[PDB]
C-alpha cells in the first residue's frame, strides 16, 4: 500500500511531498487558517484509492498525507502529526514558517521514511532555567453575584533552557495548592517516571535543546472545584456590568486582582479580548466606546467596529499588585434598533503568565540529583520561557 | 519645467491605471493642461479623463481648459483636438456637456478623418448623458455620417448604435443612413460593426431588420476577412432574426460556416462548430448537412472542439452512425484519453505517438452520451448489443479512476435498461457485473454500480447459474456499502433467495442452505446500521432465511411449501 | 478540484523546493534544485547520477531525493535501480549512510527476494559484527523485509543481539524478532520469545519504542510470550515521555486484539484483579487465566496506563488511549469508565482548539462503544461556546451519548443553551438533535425533560429543514425506548407535521415513519396521519416516496392481523372481532391504494416494488 | 467594444494593456494572468494563438487546453517571435473586429518595430500604446490601413522628439 506526505503552508503551497512504498500514483485548503482545516480528496478510481488524506497545521505549516485504502484516516494522520513535531523540535523552533520548512524538507521527508518501513508505519509516535509560563483561558458562568467557573483552561507549559553537558536528573515538586493537579504533560526530554515520581513530581533529563518540560492543561472546573476556588484574581475576574447607563454608557468594573497570582510571576501580556455580543445584536447596534478602563500597566486600545474591547496588560505588572480595569462602555448606535440592551456577553480574558503554573504547578522546589553539589557545575539559568496557549476565558453573563 | 511635467504625469496616470484615487490627482492634471504643449496637454487629458468622473472643479477646469484648446483649431490640430474631445468625452457634466456639444460640432466640421473620428466618438459619450444635446447635435451626425473617409463612418455609426443602446427612437430615425453607409463600405471591421449595430437596433424594430437583412448577406457574401461571415451569422442567429421563415438567409450563412471549419484556425472552428450546434438545435436540417464536419472534428484534438462534437452527436445519431461513433469513441478514448486522467499534461501533436487527450470533464460527458445513445430511437439497434454492454462495462472501469461519481451514477443507470432489453446479453452482464464487484476497485468509488447491479441480478438471477457467487457476493461485500447500497443489497439478496428455493433444482444446493445461514448473519450485523430503516430490512430477511433452512433441512421438494408457508407468516408477523 | 490543488502544492514545492536544491548543491553536483524539477517532472537518472557522485554531500542529497520520490509516488520510479546503489553504500561505514539506506530497503524489499537477500546478507554480517549501532538499523530492517526465508538468520543475529547489553541494539533487536515473526514462524519462536523479554527490559525511548513496536508485530500471533514481556512496556508508558506514551498505546491495541489470552477460567483473584490475568503457561507461575488481557500486569497495566496517560494531562496520550481503548475493548474493559473519564477530562482540558475536536470525535467514538461511562464527564463537554460547527455538532453527538440519570437534566440544559445561543448552523443543530434522541434512550427519568425541550425547539426556534430532519429521526428514538412519554410526543409532531406541509425530504421521512412506528401502541389514530401524508407524495423526491410508502405499508400491517381476520372481509372472522380489528381494507386500503399509485409511478423502482408488494400482501389479507 | 488589450513580452511580463471601459482591474488581471499561463502550456504550434472559453474553463484545468472564459470574454491570443499580444472583448463586439484589430497591431507593431525586442517595445510603449488607440477610437479604427499605421507612428515619435528628456 502506498502512504504519501505532503506539507503545505497556511496559504495551501504545498512544502513537502512524499511518497512511500509502492504503487503510487480548496475550501480545507483554505478554512486552513483554521488550524485544522485539509482533509481527504478520494484519487481514486475503484482502484480505490483511496485516499485519504490528512492535514496538519502546526505555527503555519500544515501536513499532508495519503494513504490508500484501508489504515484509516487516523494511522495517517498520526503520522503526520508525529512527522510535524519532529519538524518542530528540529528546526529549532520557534516557527515553522513556510519559509523554515521548505528550508528543511529533505530533513522532513526521511524523518517520514523512518517512520513508515518499518513495516509499520512506525509508528507514529551548564545552566538551568526554569520559566513557568501559564497561558490560563477561562469561562466563568455567571450566576447568583457568583462568577462560578464553569470552564478553564490553563495552559502551562513549562520550559527550562539549559546548558548542561551530561546528564544531570531534575526533580520538580509541584505544590498543590491541594487542587490534586493532575496532569503535567511532559517534553520528549522529560520523564515522568511512574507514579516514583508521583502524580505531583517530574523528572526531566538534558537534550540540549530549551525544553517545553511540562505543559499543564489544568481544567479549573474540577480544580476550582476540587480546590473551591472562586478565582479571586485570576480568572474570576469578577465583572460588574452596572446598569446606571444612559442610553450610551454604561460602567463595568472589571477587577483583576491578584491577590491569587503574588508566585505567579509575571505575566507577559493579558489580552482582555471583551467581546460585546454582536452576535445577537448586529455590530452596528453595537457600536460601541469604551472611554476610560484603568489598569496600572498597559494600554487600551478599543475595538470598535469589530465590536471589540482589546486591553494589553504588559507583563510587568507582577503581583499582588491589581490592575483594576474599570471604565465605561459607551454603546453608541448609529441605528435606535439597538435596544440599550447588549446582553453582556462573554469577556475573554486570556492571561498569559509567565512563571508560574499553570494548574497550580508551582515547582516549590527543583532539586538536581546527581552527586552533585552547587557550583559542582551545575548553573540556574535564565530564560527558559513556557508559553502556553488556550482559548480564551470566556466569561458569560 | 515641460520635461518635468511630462515625467509627474507619468507617474500619476500609472496611479490612476491602478486602482487608485483619482481626484488627487486632477489638479497636478489641470496644471499640466494649461500647457501649451499639445503632448502634455494630451497626457493631462487622458488623466483627467480617467478622473474626472464626478469631481466638478476638475471638471469644470478641465473644460474650460479644453475648450480654449479646441476653439482655436490648433493646427496640430488633429491631436490636440482629438486628444481634448476625447477627454471631453470622457467628462460628463451638464454644464460641460453644453459646453462641449458646442465644441464638438465645430469639429466635426474639420478636415482630417481623425479629427472627425474622434469627435464622433465623443458625441457619443456625451449623448450618453445629456439629451437636449443630443438632439441640437443630431443633425451634425448625419452630416458626418457623409465624409467620404470609412474610418469616420465606421465611428458615426459606432455612436448611432450607442445613443440606441440608449435611445432607440432618434435612430430609429437615421437608420437608413446607415444603411447607406453599410452599403458603401469596403472594410470587414466596418462591416462588421455595421451589422452588429443593426442588429442592436432589431433589438429594437423588426422592420429595420428586414431593411438590414438583405444588407447583410450581400456583405458577407463581399468580404472574406473571416468575421464578418460569424457576425451575419450570429445576427441571424438572434434578431431571431429567424423565426423559421428566414431558414434560407441562415441557410447561407450556415454555408459560409461549414466552408470556414475547414480553415486550421480553431478560433474559427471552434466558432462555426457552436454556431451550427445552435443552429441544429434550432434547425435538424442544416445538422444532417453537417455530419461530415463534426466527424472530421472528432478526430481532432482540440478539446474545446472534441465536446462541441460530443453535443452534436447527441442529436445527429442515425444507427450506422450510433454504432460508428461508439466505437469511435470507445476507441478513441481507449487512445484519445487518459492525458489528464492522469493530471493534466498540456497536449502536443509531435509526439508522433500522441499524448494522448481528455480533460476528466469530457470522460463524464462521452459516457454519458454513448448511454442516451444506446437510449434514442431505442438502439434496439446497436445492432450489436454485445458491444454496448461491453463499452458500459469498460466505461465504469475507467470511470474508475476519475471520480465523478456521476459518471459511475449513469453508466449504472444505463447498464440496467440494456439489461432490461436484450434478454440475451443479460447473462453476460450479469457475470461482468458480478466480477467488478469482487475487484476492489468497484467497491471503491462505488456504490451506485452496485446498486444497480444489485437489482440486475434479483430481476435475472432466475437466468443467472451462480446465482451463489452473486450471493456470496454481496454478502462478503455488504460491509464494505454506502446505505444505498447496503438497502439495496438485501433486498435484492432476499429475493434470490425466495426465488432460488422456489427454482434451486439444479440440486437443491447444500449451498443454498449454507447461503442462507450466512445472509443471516450479516443482516443481522446490518440490523447495526446506523439508518434504522435499513436496519430492519436486514433482520427481516433473517428471518426468512432462517425458516427456509428449516425447511431446507427436512428436503429439497418439499420447500417451496413449507417456505410458501412460513416466509410469509415472517415476514408478515415481524412487519405486521 | 483536489487533484488540481495537489498539483499547485507540487508546483509550489517545485519552486521553493528547486530554489533550496540549487543552494544546497552550490555543494551536491550538485542535487538542490532537482525537487524542484522533478517535483514538475523529477527522474531516476538525475537520481542515480547523484549517487554516482562521489562527494559524500552528493551521496546523501541522492540518498534522499531517492527515498522523497520512490515516496512521493513519483511512482514511474523503478525501485531495483535503487536498490542495488544503495546496498552497496550500505557496505560503506558512515552511519547517516547506513541509515539511509535502511530507509530505502524496506522501501524496496517491499518485494523483491535477490534485493532481499543482498539485503539480508549484508544485514546479517552486520549484525554479527560487534557495532550496536549498525547492527541495529541493520536489524530494522531484516525486519521491514517481509520474508520467511529470512528467519533463520535475523533469529540467530536477534538472540545474539538480545544478547548484546546496549539499549539502541535492544530496541532494533526487538524491531526484527518482531518482523520476524510477522513470517517463519515456528522455528523460530521459542527464542524469539525468551528474548524480547530480556529486552523489553531496557530504557532508552528509542529502544523502548521499538520493542513495542515490535511485540506489537510478532504476536499478533504469539501472544502467549508477549505476555511477561509486555509488562515492562506497560510500565514503562506510565513512567515516560509523553510522546513514546502514545506508540505504546499502539501497540496495547493490537496485542489485546490477540492474547485474549483465553477465555478457560478466568481467575479474578490474581492481582489487583480486573478479571484476572495469568501468567504465560509456559513460564507457569501458577497459571493465573487469561483472560489475562483484561487484567494481568500486561494488558491491565495497559488499560490503567492509558487511563494514567490521559489522565496525564497530555491531548495526545488522550486521543491515542482512547483509540486504544477502543478496541481491546471487549466491551468490559470501556464500560470502563475510568478510559473515558479520561478522555474527558482532557477535552475539557483541552483548551487548545484542535484537540476540542480530537476529543469531541474519541468521546463520540467512545460512547459508541459505551455510553455510560461518558457520564461523570459530560458537564465537562458542555460546549465550549467559542467553538465551531463541527465542534458544536461532536458536543451534540456527546451528550447524546452520555446521560445518565445525574447528568442529564444539566445536559438537556446545556443543550437546550446551546441551541438557543449558538448561532448555529443549520448542521448542528441537525446533530444536536440525533442526541438528545440517543439521550432519552437511557433516560426516563430524564426523558421528559428531553422531548420537552426537543420539541420546544423545533416549534420555537425558527428551525431549518435539515435540522427538521434530525429532530425526527429523534423523536422516533424517544418514542422507541420510552413509551410512556410517547403518546405525548407523538401528540406534539403530530402537530408539527401537519403544520408543516414544506417539509423537507429527509423530515417527512421521519414523521411519517414515526407515526408508522408509533402506531402499535395506538394504532387506532394511525389512518389519519397516514392520510396527511399521502396527500403529499405526489409532490416528492424519490427518497421520500420511498420512505412514504414503506411508512404506509407498516402502518398498513401492524394491522392487517389487526386489520385482516378484520379484512379479510366479511370474511367472517372478521365481522367477529378481536380488538384491533380495526376498519380495515378500507381506511387502511384508501391509504395504500393512493401509495401504490404513487410508486408505480415514480421513476425509483425499489418504491414501486414495495408499493406492489405491500399491495399484493395487504390485499389478499 | 474592446475592452481591453495586453501585450506580453516572452517572458509573459504584460508589457501594454488598455482597457477602454471600466472594468475591475482585479477582474481584469485575472483574466491576463490566466490568459498568460495557458498561453504557456499551449505548444509554440498552437501557440495558440486563442482561448475562447466556455467560463467553465476558466480554468478548470482538466484537459489541460481548457481554454479561458469567464463568460462573456473571449481571448484572443497572438504570438509573434517574441510577443504575445491578448485581447479581451465583449460579447457584444464581433471575433473578427477583434482578430483584424489585432493582426493589424502585430503587423503593424512588426512594421514599426521592426525588431523588437522587449527593450524596444519598452521604451517606446508609449508609441505602442499610441497605435493601439487610434485603432479603436471613435470605436472605431479609422485606419486600418497598414501603412497608415506605421505613419502615424512615426509621427507620434516626432512629438516625443521634441520633448526627450520628459520622455526617453
Redesign the interface.
Known amino acids: 500500500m502506498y502512504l504519501s506526505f505532503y506539507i503545505t503552508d497556511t496559504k495551501n503551497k504545498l512544502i513537502f511531498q512524499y511518497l512511500l512504498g509502492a504503487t503510487a500514483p480548496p475550501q480545507l485548503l483554505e478554512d486552513s487558517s483554521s488550524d485544522d482545516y485539509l482533509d481527504h480528496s478520494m484519487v481514486g478510481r475503484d482502484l480505490e484509492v483511496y485516499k485519504y488524506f490528512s492535514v496538519i497545521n502546526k505555527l503555519n505549516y500544515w501536513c499532508l498525507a495519503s494513504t490508500s485504502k484501508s489504515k484509516g484516516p487516523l494511522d495517517c494522520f498520526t503520522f503526520l502529526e508525529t512527522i510535524d513535531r519532529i519538524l518542530l523540535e528540529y528546526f529549532d523552533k520557534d516557527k515553522l514558517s513556510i519559509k523554515k520548512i521548505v528550508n528543511n524538507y529533505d530533513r522532513i521527508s526521511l524523518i517520514f521514511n523512518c517512520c513508515v518501513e518499518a513495516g509499520e508505519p512506525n509508528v507514529s509516535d551548564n545552566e538551568l532555567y526554569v520559566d513557568l509560563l501559564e497561558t490560563f483561558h477561562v469561562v466563568f458562568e455567571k450566576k447568583k453575584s457568583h462568577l462560578r467557573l464553569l470552564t478553564g483552561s490553563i495552559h502551562g507549559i513549562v520550559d527550562v533552557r539549559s546548558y548542561l553537558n551530561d546528564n544531570p536528573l531534575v526533580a520538580v515538586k509541584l505544590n498543590t495548592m491541594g487542587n490534586d493537579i493532575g496532569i503535567p504533560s511532559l517534553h520528549d526530554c522529560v520523564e515522568i517516571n511512574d507514579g516514583v515520581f508521583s502524580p505531583s513530581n517530574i523528572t526531566f533529563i538534558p537534550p540540549d535543546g530549551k525544553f517545553r518540560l511540562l505543559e499543564y492543561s489544568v481544567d479549573l472546573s474540577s480544580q476550582v472545584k476540587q480546590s473551591g476556588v472562586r478565582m479571586n484574581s485570576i480568572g474570576l475576574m469578577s465583572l460588574h456590568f452596572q446598569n446606571g447607563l444612559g442610553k450610551d454608557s454604561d460602567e463595568f468594573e472589571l477587577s483583576l486582582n491578584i491577590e491569587n497570582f503574588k508566585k505567579v510571576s509575571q505575566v507577559d501580556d493579558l489580552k482582555i479580548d471583551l467581546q460585546f455580543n454582536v452576535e445577537n445584536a448586529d455590530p452596528n447596534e453595537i457600536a460601541y466606546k469604551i472611554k476610560i478602563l484603568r489598569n496600572t500597566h498597559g494600554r487600551f486600545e478599543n475595538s470598535i467596529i469589530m465590536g471589540q474591547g482589546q486591553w494589553i496588560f504588559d507583563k510587568s505588572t507582577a503581583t499582588g499588585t491589581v490592575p483594576v480595569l474599570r471604565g465605561c462602555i459607551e454603546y453608541e448606535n448609529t441605528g435606535p434598533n439597538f435596544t440599550k440592551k447588549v446582553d453582556l456577553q462573554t469577556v475573554s480574558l486570556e492571561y498569559s503568565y509567565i512563571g508560574q503554573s499553570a494548574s497550580g504547578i508551582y515547582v516549590e522546589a527543583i532539586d538536581i540529583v546527581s552527586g552533585l553539589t552547587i557550583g559542582k557545575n551545575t548553573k540556574l539559568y535564565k530564560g527558559a520561557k513556557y508559553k502556553t496557549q488556550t482559548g480564551n476565558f470566556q466569561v458569560r453573563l | 519645467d515641460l520635461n518635468s511635467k511630462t515625467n509627474a504625469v507619468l507617474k500619476l496616470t500609472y496611479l490612476e491605471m491602478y486602482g487608485f484615487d483619482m481626484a488627487w490627482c486632477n489638479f497636478h492634471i489641470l496644471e499640466v493642461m494649461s500647457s501649451n504643449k499639445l503632448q502634455q496637454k494630451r497626457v493631462g487629458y487622458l488623466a483627467a479623463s480617467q478622473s474626472f468622473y464626478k469631481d466638478s472643479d476638475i471638471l469644470m477646469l478641465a473644460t474650460n481648459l479644453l475648450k480654449k484648446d479646441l476653439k482655436y483649431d490648433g493646427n496640430n490640430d488633429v491631436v490636440k483636438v482629438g486628444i481634448a474631445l476625447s477627454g471631453l468625452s470622457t467628462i460628463i457634466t451638464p454644464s460641460l456637456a453644453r459646453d462641449i456639444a458646442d465644441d464638438l460640432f465645430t469639429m466635426l466640421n474639420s478636415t482630417r478623418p481623425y479629427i472627425r473620428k474622434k469627435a464622433i466618438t465623443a458625441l457619443f459619450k456625451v449623448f450618453l448623458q445629456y439629451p437636449e444635446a443630443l438632439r441640437d447635435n443630431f443633425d451634425k451626425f448625419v452630416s458626418k455620417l457623409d465624409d467620404d473617409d470609412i474610418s469616420v463612418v465606421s465611428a458615426a455609426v459606432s455612436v448611432i448604435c450607442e445613443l440606441s443602446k440608449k435611445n432607440p427612437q432618434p435612430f430609429i430615425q437615421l437608420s437608413p443612413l446607415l444603411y447607406e453607409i453599410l452599403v458603401t463600405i469596403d472594410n470587414n471591421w466596418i462591416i462588421i460593426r455595421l451589422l452588429k449595430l443593426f442588429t442592436n437596433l432589431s433589438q429594437v424594430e423588426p422592420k429595420l431588420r428586414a431593411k438590414l437583412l438583405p444588407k447583410i448577406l450581400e456583405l458577407m457574401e463581399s468580404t472574406v476577412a473571416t468575421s464578418v461571415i460569424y457576425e451575419s451569422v450570429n445576427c441571424i442567429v438572434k434578431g431571431n432574426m429567424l423565426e423559421e421563415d428566414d431558414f434560407e438567409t441562415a441557410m447561407a450563412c450556415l454555408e459560409r460556416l461549414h466552408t470556414f471549419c475547414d480553415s486550421q484556425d480553431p478560433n474559427l472552428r471552434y466558432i462555426s462548430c457552436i454556431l451550427f450546434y445552435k443552429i441544429g438545435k434550432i434547425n435538424t436540417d442544416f445538422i444532417s448537412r453537417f455530419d461530415q464536419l463534426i466527424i472530421r472534428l472528432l478526430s481532432d484534438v482540440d478539446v474545446s472542439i472534441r465536446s462541441k462534437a460530443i453535443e452534436l452527436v447527441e442529436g445527429i445519431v442515425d444507427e450506422d452512425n450510433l454504432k460508428a461513433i461508439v466505437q469511435t469513441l470507445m476507441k478513441q478514448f481507449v487512445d484519445e484519453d487518459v492525458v489528464i486522467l492522469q493530471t493534466g499534461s498540456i497536449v502536443y501533436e509531435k509526439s508522433k505517438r500522441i499524448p494522448i487527450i481528455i480533460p476528466e470533464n469530457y470522460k463524464i460527458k462521452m459516457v454519458n452520451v454513448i448511454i442516451s445513445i444506446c437510449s434514442a430511437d431505442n438502439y434496439s439497434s446497436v445492432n450489436d448489443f454485445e458491444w454496448y454492454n461491453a463499452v458500459i462495462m469498460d466505461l465504469a472501469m475507467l470511470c474508475q479512476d476519475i471520480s465523478d461519481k456521476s459518471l459511475g451514477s449513469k453508466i449504472g443507470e444505463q447498464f440496467r435498461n440494456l439489461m432490461i432489453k436484450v434478454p440475451s446479453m443479460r447473462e453476460v452482464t450479469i457475470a461482468n457485473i458480478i466480477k467488478l464487484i469482487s475487484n476492489d476497485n468497484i467497491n471503491k468509488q462505488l456504490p451506485t454500480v452496485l446498486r444497480e447491479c444489485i437489482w440486475c441480478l434479483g430481476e435475472f438471477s432466475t437466468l443467472v447459474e451462480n446465482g451463489n457467487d452473486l450471493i456470496k457476493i454481496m454478502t462478503e461485500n455488504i460491509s464494505y456499502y454506502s446505505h444505498s447500497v447496503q438497502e439495496v443489497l438485501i433486498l435484492a439478496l432476499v429475493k434470490v433467495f425466495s426465488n432460488w428455493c422456489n427454482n434451486f433444482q439444479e440440486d437443491k444446493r447444500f449451498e443454498i442452505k449454507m447461503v442462507l445461514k450466512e445472509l443471516i448473519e450479516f443482516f443481522e450485523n446490518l440490523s447495526y446500521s446506523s439508518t434504522f430503516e435499513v436496519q430492519e430490512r436486514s433482520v427481516e430477511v433473517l428471518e426468512f432465511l432462517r425458516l427456509s433452512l428449516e425447511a431446507l433441512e427436512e428436503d429439497t421438494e418439499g420447500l417451496p411449501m413449507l417456505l410458501s408457508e412460513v416466509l410469509p407468516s415472517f415476514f408478515n408477523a415481524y412487519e405486521l | ?13 517545485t519552486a ?2 528547486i530554489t ?1 536544491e540549487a543552494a544546497a548543491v552550490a555543494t551536491s553536483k550538485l542535487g538542490e534544485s532537482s ?1 524542484t524539477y522533478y ?1 514538475q517532472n523529477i527522474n531516476p537518472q538525475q537520481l542515480v547520477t547523484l549517487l554516482n557522485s562521489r562527494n559524500s554531500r552528493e551521496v546523501r ?1 541522492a540518498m ?1 531525493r531517492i ?9 514511474s520510479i523503478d525501485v531495483q535501480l535503487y536498490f542495488a546503489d544503495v546496498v552497496k553504500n550500505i557496505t560503506t561505514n558512515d552511519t547517516k549512510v547506513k ?2 539506506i ?6 524496496f ?2 518485494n523483491d527476494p535477490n534485493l532481499t537477500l543482498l539485503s539480508i546478507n549484508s544485514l546479517q554480517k552486520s549484525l554479527s559484527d560487534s557495532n550496536s549501532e549498525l547492527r541495529c538499523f541493520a536489524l ?2 531484516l ?2 523485509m ?1 520474508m520467511s526465508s529470512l528467519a533463520p538468520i535475523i533469529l540467530h543475529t536477534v538472540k545474539k543481539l538480545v544478547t548484546d547489553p546496549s539499549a539502541m541494539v535492544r530496541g532494533e533487536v526487538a ?1 526484527a524478532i518482531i ?1 520476524l515473526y ?1 513470517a517463519g514462524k515456528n522455528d523460530y519462536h521459542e527464542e524469539l520469545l525468551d528474548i524480547l523479554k530480556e529486552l523489553m527490559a531496557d530504557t532508552d ?1 528509542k529502544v523502548i ?2 520493542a513495542v ?1 515490535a511485540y ?2 510478532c504476536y499478533a500471533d504469539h501472544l502467549e510470550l508477549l505476555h511477561g514481556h509486555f509488562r515492562r512496556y506497560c ?1 514503562i508508558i ?11 498505546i ?1 501497540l496495547l491495541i493490537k496485542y489485546c486484539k490477540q492474547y485474549l489470552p483465553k477465555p478457560t477460567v478466568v481467575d479474578k483473584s490474581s492481582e489487583g484483579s480486573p478479571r484476572s490475568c495469568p501468567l504465560p503457561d509456559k513460564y507457569n507461575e501458577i497459571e493465573y487465566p487469561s483472560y489475562e488481557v483484561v487484567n494481568d500486569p500486561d494488558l491491565d497495566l495497559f488499560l490503567q496506563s492509558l487511563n ?1 496517560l490521559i ?7 488522550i486521543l ?1 488511549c482512547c ?1 486504544a481503548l477502543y478496541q481491546l475493548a471487549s466491551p468490559l474493559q470501556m464500560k470502563n469508565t475510568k478510559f473515558i473519564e479520561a478522555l474527558v ?2 477535552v ?7 484537540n476540542k ?1 480530537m476529543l469531541l470525535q474519541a468521546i463520540h467514538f467512545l460512547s459508541i462503544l459505551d455510553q455510560t461511562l461518558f457520564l461523570p464527564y459530560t ?2 463537554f ?1 460546549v ?3 467553538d ?1 460547527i463541527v465542534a458544536s455538532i461532536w458536543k451534540i453527538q456527546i451528550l447524546s451519548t452520555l446521560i445518565n440519570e445525574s447528568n442529564v437534566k444539566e445536559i438537556f440544559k446545556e443543550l437546550k443553551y446551546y441551541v438557543a445561543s449558538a ?1 448555529f448552523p443549520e448542521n448542528v443543530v441537525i446533530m444536536a438533535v440525533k442526541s438528545l434522541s440517543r439521550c432519552g434512550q437511557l433516560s426516563t427519568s430524564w426523558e421528559s425533560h428531553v422531548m420537552k425541550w426537543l420539541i420546544d425547539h423545533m416549534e420555537s426556534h425558527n428551525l431549518s429543514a435539515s435540522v427538521l430532519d434530525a429532530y425526527v429521526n429523534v423523536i422516533r428514538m424517544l418514542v422507541q425506548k420510552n413509551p410512556t412519554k410517547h403518546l405525548r410526543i407523538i401528540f406534539k409532531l403530530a402537530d408539527l407535521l401537519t403544520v408543516q406541509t414544506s417539509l423537507a425530504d429527509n423530515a417527512r421521512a421521519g414523521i411519517v ?1 414515526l407515526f408508522g412506528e408509533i402506531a402499535s401502541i395506538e394504532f387506532k389514530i394511525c389512518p389519519d396521519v397516514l392520510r396527511r401524508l399521502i396527500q403529499n407524495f405526489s409532490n416528492e423526491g424519490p427518497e421520500t416516496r420511498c ?1 412514504i410508502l ?1 411508512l404506509s ?2 402502518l398498513l ?6 386489520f385482516k381476520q378484520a379484512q379479510v372481509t366479511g370474511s367472517e372472522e372478521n365481522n367477529q372481532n378481536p380488538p384491533y380489528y380495526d376498519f380495515s381494507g378500507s381506511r387502511i386500503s384508501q391509504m395504500y391504494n393512493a401509495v401504490l399509485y404513487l410508486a408505480k409511478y415514480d421513476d425509483e ?2 418504491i414501486r416494488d414495495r408499493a406492489r408488494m405491500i399491495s399484493s ?1 395487504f390485499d389478499s389479507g | 467594444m474592446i475592452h481591453a488589450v495586453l501585450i506580453f513580452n516572452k517572458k509573459c511580463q504584460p508589457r501594454l494593456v488598455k482597457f477602454y471601459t471600466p472594468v475591475d482591474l482585479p477582474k481584469q488581471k485575472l483574466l491576463l494572468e490566466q490568459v498568460y499561463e495557458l498561453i504557456s502550456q499551449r505548444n509554440s504550434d498552437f501557440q495558440s494563438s486563442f482561448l475562447v472559453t466556455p467560463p467553465s474553463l476558466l480554468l478548470s484545468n482538466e484537459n489541460n487546453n481548457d481554454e479561458v472564459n469567464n463568460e462573456d470574454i473571449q481571448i484572443i491570443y497572438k504570438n509573434y517571435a517574441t510577443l504575445y499580444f491578448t485581447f479581451i472583448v465583449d460579447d457584444q463586439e464581433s471575433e473578427l473586429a477583434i482578430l483584424d484589430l489585432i493582426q493589424t497591431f502585430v503587423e503593424s507593431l512588426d512594421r514599426c518595430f521592426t525588431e523588437v525586442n522587449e527593450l524596444d517595445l519598452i521604451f517606446n510603449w508609449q508609441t505602442l500604446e499610441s497605435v493601439l488607440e487610434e485603432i479603436v477610437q471613435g470605436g472605431m479604427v479609422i485606419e486600418t490601413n497598414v501603412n497608415r499605421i506605421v505613419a502615424s507612428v512615426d509621427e507620434l515619435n516626432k512629438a516625443a522628439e521634441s520633448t526627450d528628456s520628459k520622455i526617453g
Open positions: 478540484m483536489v487533484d488540481s490543488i495537489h498539483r499547485i502544492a507540487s508546483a509550489l514545492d521553493k523546493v533550496r525537487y517535483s542529497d534522499k527515498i522523497s520520490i520512490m515516496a512521493s509516488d513519483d511512482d541509515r539511509l535502511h530507509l530505502y530497503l524496506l522501501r524489499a517491499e530494522s530492517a525486519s521491514d517481509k524491531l518482523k510477522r525511548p519504542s521499538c513496536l506489537k508485530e510500565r506510565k513512567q515516560l515521555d509523553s510522546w513514546s506514551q502514545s506508540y505504546l499502539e494514567c489522565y496525564s494531562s497530555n491531548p495526545t496520550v491515542s483509540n477530562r482532557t475539557t482540558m483541552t483548551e487548545n482548539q484542535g475536536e458537564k465537562k458542555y465550549f461556546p467559542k465551531p448561532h415513519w420512505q414503506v405499508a407498516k400491517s401492524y394491522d392487517i392481523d389487526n423502482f425499489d400482501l
